[PDB]
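This part of the workshop introduces the protein records we will be handling. A record pairs a protein's sequence with a compact description of its fold. As an example, a complete record with its sequence and its structure tokens follows.

_____
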Amino acid sequence: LYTNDIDCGPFISDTLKIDNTSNQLEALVEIYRMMRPGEPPTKEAAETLFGNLFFSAERYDLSAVGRMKFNRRIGRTEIEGPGVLSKEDIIDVLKTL
């Protein structure tokens, strides 16, 4: 366990100590339950909903301005980029936070 206390306070570690969500399927079902409540979740339905909300060129888009600003604010030499949120883009956002 490599960390620090005064700075680098592992808030992310504390967050990882909750929600009892081990399988990626567990995360997907929790997401489909929170976002689309009432209907009991199905693996295919939850996966499709998550993908559509996350990285679909339709139903989600950052303009060139949006992608450039995300790259600049998070820090990145690249100016242009894809219109959808990258898989590691969220990781960079948490890192910045």
Q: What stands out?
A: Residues 43-55 form the longest helix (13 residues). Residues 33 and 41 are 6 Å apart (CA to CA).
